[PDB]
């Protein structure tokens, strides 16, 4: 399966995905890395791996449905089968999420039914849970509510801050994101017709 990773920052998860797809048994290949910003060091890691990089910029023109179309064009140019959101800070339009239904993966820093949103760690700490984690799921129109592929629980330690807890959860992210991409790319897991995850 041909893969495109959309980033917006450092992209630590991108590196994990790059290392994973380079293994001989990987059923996925990363062909294009699309960045939201044009500075972020995610593009550099892509370059070091010899992966085509390419930017966009909202400031360049139009509404939302357009910006996504500018991306979708690059996706068509490279014949992409699967999309991985690796720290892509920019909501997608309803049509784009429609076009790539069951073909776009996202990693969220919480045991998902809980703490949906962009500040999951702050919520977890404020709520006082002793166990949190991360989730890889198919992207649906309903934010952070697509079908769950994999999850990994991570303990919260007393005195934890966003800096220390995110660091611990990040180690779990580097494990399940690549594993989930392999499950989807190999055809082992797919968005089920009954709406639920299907393990063939």
């Amino acid at each position: 399966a041909r893969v495109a990773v959309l980033i917006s920052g450092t992209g630590s998860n991108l590196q994990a995905l790059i290392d994973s797809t380079r293994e001989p048994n990987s059923s996925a290949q990363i062909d294009i890395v699309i960045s939201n910003k044009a500075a972020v060091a995610g593009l550099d890691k892509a370059e070091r791996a010899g992966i085509p990089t390419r930017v966009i910029n909202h400031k360049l023109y139009k509404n939302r449905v357009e910006f996504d179309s500018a991306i979708d064009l690059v996706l068509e140019e490279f014949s992409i089968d699967i999309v991985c959101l690796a720290g892509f800070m920019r909501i997608l339009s309803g049509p784009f999420v429609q076009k790539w239904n069951g073909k776009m993966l996202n990693i969220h820093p919480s045991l998902l039914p809980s703490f949906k949103g962009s500040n999951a760690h702050e919520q977890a700490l404020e709520t006082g849970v002793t166990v949190t984690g991360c989730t890889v799921h198919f992207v649906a129109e309903d934010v952070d509510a697509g079908q769950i592929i994999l999850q990994e629980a991570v303990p919260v330690k007393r005195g934890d801050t966003v800096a220390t807890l995110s660091e611990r959860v990040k180690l779990a992210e580097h494990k399940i994101f690549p594993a989930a991409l392999q499950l989807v790319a190999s055809g082992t897991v797919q968005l089920g017709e009954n709406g639920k995850i299907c393990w063939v």
Side-chain angles (χ1 to χ4, degrees):
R2 301 175 60 71
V3 181
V5 180
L6 304 184
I7 64 175
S8 294
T10 301
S12 60
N13 273 311
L14 171 66
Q15 190 54 50
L17 293 172
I18 289 177
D19 297 353
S20 182
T21 57
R22 279 179 167 286
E23 299 294 285
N25 285 175
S26 170
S27 296
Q29 60 173 120
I30 298 173
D31 297 303
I32 180 62
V33 164
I34 298 175
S35 179
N36 194 66
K37 302 300 180 180
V40 301
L43 302 170
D44 192 298
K45 269 173 293 190
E47 298 185 307
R48 283 194 173 188
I51 303 176
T53 55
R54 208 151 295 181
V55 295
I56 303 291
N57 225 337
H58 232 79
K59 274 190 171 182
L60 283 196
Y61 214 76
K62 227 177 299 168
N63 176 61
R64 177 178 299 173
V65 184
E66 169 286 314
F67 171 90
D68 299 324
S69 296
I71 294 178
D72 185 73
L73 182 66
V74 182
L75 259 35
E76 293 296 358
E77 190 200 317
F78 291 75
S79 310
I80 301 306
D81 300 301
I82 297 168
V83 178
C84 286
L85 266 27
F88 189 61
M89 299 300 98
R90 186 165 300 187
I91 179 177
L92 296 307
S93 60
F96 184 100
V97 174
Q98 207 76 58
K99 188 186 187 303
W100 296 90
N101 188 216
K103 306 297 181 181
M104 192 164 50
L105 317 182
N106 175 242
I107 178 80
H108 185 68
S110 83
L111 289 182
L112 250 190
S114 303
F115 314 132
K116 301 172 181 293
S118 64
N119 57 326
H121 296 313
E122 289 78 353
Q123 302 182 233
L125 291 168
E126 174 181 61
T127 302
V129 298
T130 65
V131 171
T132 182
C134 54
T135 304
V136 178
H137 62 90
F138 277 121
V139 176
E141 201 168 299
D142 197 318
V143 64
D144 295 343
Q147 287 291 293
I148 298 176
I149 300 167
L150 296 179
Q151 294 187 291
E152 175 165 341
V154 176
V156 176
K157 297 184 185 301
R158 261 110 60 198
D160 254 340
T161 62
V162 162
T164 64
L165 177 66
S166 64
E167 175 176 60
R168 199 177 309 115
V169 174
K170 218 63 177 182
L171 295 172
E173 287 175 29
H174 297 340
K175 286 166 55 187
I176 61 167
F177 208 169
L181 173 58
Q182 170 66 196
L183 289 173
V184 173
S186 68
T188 302
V189 167
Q190 51 178 48
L191 196 61
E193 190 181 306
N194 67 5
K196 311 297 161 297
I197 283 294
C198 180
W199 286 72
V200 304

Coordinates of all heavy atoms in Angstrom, one line a residue, residues 15 20 43 53 59 70 112 130 138 140 143 158 168 184-185 188-189 197:
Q15 N 9.0 9.6 12.2 CA 10.2 8.8 12.2 C 9.9 7.3 12.5 O 10.5 6.4 11.9 CB 11.2 9.4 13.2 CG 12.6 8.8 13.1 CD 13.2 8.9 11.7 OE1 13.2 9.9 11.1 NE2 13.7 7.7 11.3
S20 N 9.5 1.8 10.6 CA 8.7 0.7 10.4 C 8.5 0.2 9.0 O 8.6 -0.9 8.6 CB 7.3 1.0 11.0 OG 6.5 -0.2 11.0
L43 N 9.7 17.7 7.7 CA 10.2 17.7 6.3 C 11.6 17.2 6.2 O 12.0 16.6 5.2 CB 10.0 19.1 5.7 CG 8.6 19.6 5.7 CD1 8.6 21.1 5.2 CD2 7.7 18.8 4.8
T53 N 9.0 15.5 -0.3 CA 8.3 16.4 0.6 C 7.6 17.5 -0.2 O 7.9 17.7 -1.4 CB 9.4 17.2 1.5 OG1 10.3 17.8 0.6 CG2 10.1 16.2 2.4
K59 N -2.5 30.5 3.7 CA -2.4 31.9 3.3 C -2.3 32.0 1.8 O -2.4 33.1 1.2 CB -1.1 32.5 3.9 CG -1.3 33.1 5.3 CD -0.1 33.9 5.7 CE -0.4 34.7 7.0 NZ 0.8 35.6 7.4
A70 N -6.2 20.9 -2.4 CA -4.8 21.1 -2.8 C -4.0 20.0 -2.4 O -3.0 19.6 -3.0 CB -4.3 22.4 -2.2
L112 N -9.1 7.1 24.0 CA -10.2 7.7 23.2 C -11.6 7.9 23.6 O -12.2 9.0 23.5 CB -10.2 7.3 21.8 CG -9.8 8.5 20.9 CD1 -10.0 8.3 19.4 CD2 -10.5 9.8 21.3
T130 N -5.5 7.8 36.9 CA -4.2 7.2 37.2 C -3.7 6.4 36.0 O -2.5 6.0 35.9 CB -4.2 6.3 38.5 OG1 -5.0 5.2 38.2 CG2 -4.8 7.1 39.7
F138 N -9.6 5.2 12.7 CA -9.9 5.7 11.4 C -10.5 7.1 11.6 O -11.3 7.3 12.5 CB -10.8 4.7 10.7 CG -10.2 3.5 10.1 CD1 -10.6 2.2 10.5 CD2 -9.3 3.7 9.1 CE1 -10.0 1.1 9.9 CE2 -8.7 2.6 8.5 CZ -9.1 1.3 8.9
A140 N -13.0 9.9 11.1 CA -14.4 10.1 10.6 C -14.7 11.6 10.7 O -13.9 12.4 11.2 CB -15.3 9.3 11.6
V143 N -15.1 14.3 14.9 CA -13.8 14.4 15.5 C -13.5 13.4 16.6 O -14.2 13.2 17.5 CB -13.6 15.9 16.0 CG1 -14.6 16.1 17.2 CG2 -12.2 16.1 16.5
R158 N 2.0 10.4 40.0 CA 1.7 11.6 40.9 C 2.8 12.7 40.6 O 4.0 12.4 40.6 CB 1.7 11.2 42.4 CG 0.3 11.0 42.9 CD 0.1 9.6 43.2 NE 1.0 9.0 44.2 CZ 1.3 7.8 44.4 NH1 0.6 6.8 43.7 NH2 2.2 7.4 45.3
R168 N 5.9 10.0 28.2 CA 5.6 8.6 28.5 C 4.6 8.0 27.5 O 4.7 6.9 27.0 CB 5.1 8.4 29.9 CG 5.2 7.0 30.4 CD 4.8 6.8 31.9 NE 5.5 7.8 32.7 CZ 4.9 8.8 33.4 NH1 3.5 9.0 33.3 NH2 5.6 9.7 34.1
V184 N -3.6 -2.2 8.7 CA -4.4 -1.7 7.6 C -3.8 -1.9 6.2 O -4.5 -2.4 5.3 CB -4.7 -0.2 7.8 CG1 -5.4 0.4 6.6 CG2 -5.5 0.1 9.1
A185 N -2.5 -1.6 6.1 CA -1.9 -1.8 4.8 C -1.8 -3.2 4.3 O -1.8 -3.5 3.1 CB -0.4 -1.2 4.9
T188 N -5.3 -6.7 7.0 CA -5.7 -7.5 8.1 C -6.9 -6.8 8.8 O -7.7 -7.5 9.4 CB -4.5 -7.7 9.1 OG1 -3.4 -8.4 8.4 CG2 -5.0 -8.5 10.3
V189 N -6.9 -5.5 8.8 CA -7.9 -4.7 9.4 C -8.5 -3.7 8.4 O -7.8 -3.1 7.7 CB -7.4 -3.9 10.7 CG1 -8.4 -2.9 11.1 CG2 -7.1 -4.9 11.8
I197 N -14.9 -2.1 13.3 CA -13.6 -2.6 12.8 C -13.8 -4.1 12.4 O -14.4 -4.8 13.1 CB -12.5 -2.5 13.8 CG1 -12.0 -1.0 13.9 CG2 -11.3 -3.4 13.5 CD1 -11.3 -0.6 12.6

